[PDB]
Subunit: 312 residues, 4 copies
């Protein structure tokens, strides 16, 4: 397939390298405002193709997205000194809208995966300005945090991550919700299995939830940014579209009305295939989860409203 | 690793071909009473290695199992005319015991996977005569029927088989038990999800259970025997030992006491790694399931007792 | 892609199983005159798909080849008692012509790979009766014998088969020609490298040529037939069409005039891609090789002429 | 296997990410003088392991190399302003010696692959200070430039890179030597095949030689540095050790006396397996090639001598 990447920073370039090794792209267009950087990146990957699958990689402009099966948006600006988070978001939101008109124009039939943070806020702004199908434009969301929570549990208990079931939903941020009420290992409720398993107990499941929601912060304090993790997750998402797998992924999707939350992009279990999102799984949230989920949706709508209100 | 296959009939040879393409064997010993057939089989696979991974394949005798990481038993005799099923089993049971002393003698440290039918009856006879660890000798059991039930459901509902959870336990035969009470799709109970999904409803889940328990009969009426399906399942089991995955598989294991069934080999969810079986998952069976499961164990013990009683 | 297999005997079925594990077919049609056998084969492979890629496999009739990207012909009859080889060939040649009209009719745009023996004689009869493009219909030829000769040499000398160059051309039979004059290891002529390498010398390269041309005979004396080797080679050929690789393969192609041989199907280095054969490499044969090659072409034309003459 | 990476700059980290996706490391130790950067890198890759194979990745110190099967050296310092190339090399050479004593001390049984530029000069300094086996310590050399030259030719002519033979030897720099005299496509000399092929002719083969020796310069002018290409090449080299393939690679090896060049590390065709380098292929260089090769060795020895002379 043909893949376009808009924004070749640490994440865009890592995503490109990963997609290259997976071998999903026949043609790969790299688009960044700093054309010189995008071109050197393209030549570097081209110089490594003798060890990967043949791919037509090149640094282009928006007109090249024509024919793109998937367009990945890893484009954004860095917080200026003094700069406020609302301002920062104001700038990034404007970046999203700009890229959107162009993707809408040259690649109207593509599937777009937004990756920049805040992912749920920026995906909503991109979708709105784009005017495309909500089943074909979405954000990576909590996909990575869900997989990470399943992995921590699995390796502590002596199981394959394949045997562990858990979903983290909501804002891909401080207010995400691990849905512990539907968690299992071997289909057996996470609580029986948790205290059969030795290196498991209540204090440890809480650490996990905490180790996963802090992962990015901890990487950033040490090296300024995360790019590898999200790169591998974007490859994994693309992998489901590529083979039309219909796997369930907690992607940030535009929901018309899900458990009382409305008109916003947020993460919930949906199935992904070659035509984009298909089924949205409505979860049976216990009381505390429903409340946390709802509060999450409100933190997002508020942010959406402050920005929509500070550009008018 | 080094793999030995004892019994190169339709199943043994198909299993060997499949294992060859997976590339799990560095050395592969083929043992059959008809040495001429085993040798031509070995030369044929050797002649195809230019397209697979290097492997040291050869037709040997029992002394060659020395060093075997895994030994697969697909050895058995065909029902003579007039021959009774009890007699037939009497003969096959004797085959199992014979192979057992030899495997015990030359490859005491291997992991053995019994595949011949009746799988639960013959595995029990093999284990007993062998005197090996019940965590390292087991039968393939209901592994294939479980995967097949998950696949039917999945493709009818528009999900990846990875999102479907169901276990079929008990005798790998007419009395197997699909554990519908713990069935799910996306962690959501199979009943909500079943009637959200269009090509699903009660009459169809019953067909599935029936299509999967009859699969072998239907193949046999048409071509005399099954070998491809079981070959792919044996490869899959070996794959878990090979990468030490700890995946949950409904293998036929020797149970000391599981839900009131005792002293017999039967299928239940257990985890498989490089050292053999590790955890046995005790399932929460509803009333009717517990009863079906128990009846299953009784059909097996009876058969075990009739044969143990018609060789003394 | 969609693949049809006409003739599900030991080879056709082995080829189907192998193609299934490679995961090249989205849809697979099995056609055999013994419909009951083809159907049980289809159900067996279907029952194993939970461990492979989703594939639409089924036993059909000629009308189903519609849309086939590749059609494999492993169909043929066995020598009756008393039966002469010329007669036998007369029968098989008639089988080839029959299958040809049907493939021409329902799948005129497919790429056909003939596999039945004698491969060069039967491919020529199939092509002629079919009236299709000589670049899209061909026989597997010496593909397997070439790979096997490269492998023997490589493993004796301590090199990867990738570093060994040799071609065996001509009749895929007793008169095949290993082109020793262009043989190399690391691009260094096989003779310098041969006596630098310890387990190499003139008497051993001759054994190799002999071990490879006798491989099938030796398998057949032991188990009645070869099927695994050729199955893996057919998968490998299909693999080049599938990813459009343009790899060089000694396939049995219809040559209009190559080194003085004319109007016949015989093996020589040609490149294979998604559209079939592309380039035919004309080799620089030394004196003795040119003579052996020519004699080979004459043994084939003679056989072609005796059969064309004993059906008129 | 266990892999250590010393120097996590753009190349070290790219190499780590690539090795991670290949799945060659069971345990991966990242060592950089800037421990904070190495630790954030380790956490980032760990956070992405839910999508790759289980691996024990962590930022350590030299004592952790204990047990390392392979150690990769991508460590070096950047040219200070005003700084001379000889000085720069003086500094980097000292870095190499330092890392060497430590690798010699804690991981004496590992295979080391030097990657920093100048690769042939720095590998020689590392080997000398280390006192290890010349068959287990070497530089990546011209591996990437050789593959790139084979790829350019192949895709222009309509062949698989597998069918193209060419070696580039000598200094991995401005004086590298493409050995055109032994170049082939399908074993047919590159000159016949070159003017049979349309998009090939003398002016184009020269462009190729030029496009490949300038690749890094062109990347660097655009984005300051190359890391992806070399990362994929290092993975490929590790891949040969990992599966003990014995593939021929133009690695920078210590040569005692090869075609009159002596006591230096330079690139030539050697075979690589699980125990390191095995066979060194002595090439039949025509006149002009022998001269270019020799001049190459002299440019390297001179540099080696100026540095050995400006630290005493
Ligand atoms: N650690 C992280 O990865 C992290 C942390 C916080 C926020 N973010 C957000 O997510 C984004 C992705 O992070 P990154 O580290 O890969 O970014 P980065 O530091 O590489 O910056 C963005 C890249 O996108 C490009 N770009 C900007 N505007 C563009 C436009 N209009 N059209 C095309 N290309 C454009 C820039 O030129 C730059 O190359 C960030 O820009 C930021 O807003 C990321
Ligand atoms: N459709 C089926 O696959 C099927 C159906 C019913 C029962 N079974 C049972 O499972 C077994 C596997 O089926 P198959 O179709 O692959 O078998 P098969 O028809 O090929 O027969 C068994 C093979 O095992 C070999 N063998 C027998 N005793 C041996 C011994 N003592 N030591 C070494 N090798 C020995 C035989 O020589 C023969 O090659 C059968 O023997 C049978 O008892 C299979
Ligand atoms: N060892 C070998 O593999 C070998 C040796 C000598 C010759 N051959 C030749 O190559 C062929 C392939 O060998 P095999 O062992 O796989 O064959 P086989 O023994 O399975 O016999 C051929 C199969 O092709 C089917 N078939 C025959 N005519 C057909 C038709 N007109 N339409 C559709 N299907 C048809 C038959 O029903 C049978 O299922 C042989 O038929 C023979 O002529 C093979
Ligand atoms: N474009 C290129 O990749 C390029 C171009 C010219 C030269 N080089 C040479 O090859 C090397 C690899 O290039 P890069 O771009 O990946 O480097 P880089 O810019 O990331 O710099 C080197 C890294 O190695 C680390 N390091 C330095 N000394 C160390 C020590 N003694 N122990 C442990 N870690 C140490 C540094 O802290 C830094 O993280 C360069 O340092 C340079 O000497 C590379
Ligand atoms: O929209 P555009 O300008 O056609 O972009 C694509 C073209 O630019 C190129 O990628 C070259 O770009 P760079 O010169 O910047 O490397 C061509 O290879 C490609 O066909
Ligand atoms: O591992 P099993 O036996 O399929 O059962 C549970 C796993 O499947 C699940 O439905 C999860 O599926 P997904 O994660 O693909 O949505 C949960 O039950 C858990 O994730
Ligand atoms: O127990 P044994 O007789 O050593 O068996 C193994 C030996 O037999 C062989 O496999 C050859 O067997 P065949 O001659 O029957 O083909 C050797 O290659 C191998 O080393
Ligand atoms: O040319 P036809 O008869 O449509 O053949 C294909 C059809 O036959 C089937 O394969 C079933 O064949 P069998 O009943 O013989 O198994 C269908 O699944 C398929 O759509
Ligand atoms: O030589 P050392 O200090 O044991 O290094 C390895 C140890 O450091 C760790 O990698 C942790 O390193 P960081 O705390 O820097 O992340 C452990 O996980 C590991 O066992
Ligand atoms: O592609 P073939 O037919 O093996 O022949 C040539 C290729 O093999 C070669 O020996 C090259 O081998 P390596 O590149 O592995 O050393 C050359 O002849 C060319 O690289």
């Amino acid at each position: 397939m043909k893949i376009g990447i808009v924004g070749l920073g640490r994440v865009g370039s890592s995503t490109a390298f990963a997609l290259l090794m997976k071998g999903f792209a026949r043609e790969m267009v790299l688009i960044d405002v700093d054309k010189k950087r995008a071109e050197g990146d393209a030549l570097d990957l081209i110089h490594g193709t003798p060890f990967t699958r043949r791919a037509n990689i090149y640094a282009g402009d928006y007109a090249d997205l024509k024919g793109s099966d998937v367009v990945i948006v890893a484009a954004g600006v860095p917080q200026k000194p003094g700069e406020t988070r609302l301002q920062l978001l104001g700038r990034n939101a404007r970046v999203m809208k700009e890229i959107a008109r162009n993707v809408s124009k040259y690649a109207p039939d593509s599937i777009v995966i937004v990756v920049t943070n805040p992912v749920d806020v920026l995906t909503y702004f991109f979708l709105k300005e784009s005017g495309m199908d909500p089943r074909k434009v979405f954000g990576s969301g909590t996909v990575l945090d869900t997989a990470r929570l399943r992995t921590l549990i699995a390796q502590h208990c002596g199981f394959s991550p394949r045997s562990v079931h858990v979903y983290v939903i909501g804002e891909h941020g401080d207010s995400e919700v691990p849905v512990w009420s539907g968690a299992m290992i071997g289909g057996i409720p996470l609580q029986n299995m948790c205290q059969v398993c030795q290196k498991c107990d209540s204090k440890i499941l809480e650490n996990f939830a905490e180790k996963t929601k802090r992962a990015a912060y901890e990487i950033i304090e040490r090296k300024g940014a995360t790019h590898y993790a999200i790169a591998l997750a974007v490859a994994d998402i693309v992998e489901s579209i590529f083979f039309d797998e219909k796997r369930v992924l907690t992607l940030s999707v535009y929901l018309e009305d899900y458990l009382g939350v409305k008109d916003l992009c947020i993460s919930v279990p949906v199935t992904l295939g070659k035509h984009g999102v298909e089924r949205i799984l409505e979860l049976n949230l216990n009381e505390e989860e429903l409340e946390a989920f709802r509060k999450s949706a409100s933190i997002l709508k508020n942010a959406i409203n402050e920005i929509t209100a500070e550009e008018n």
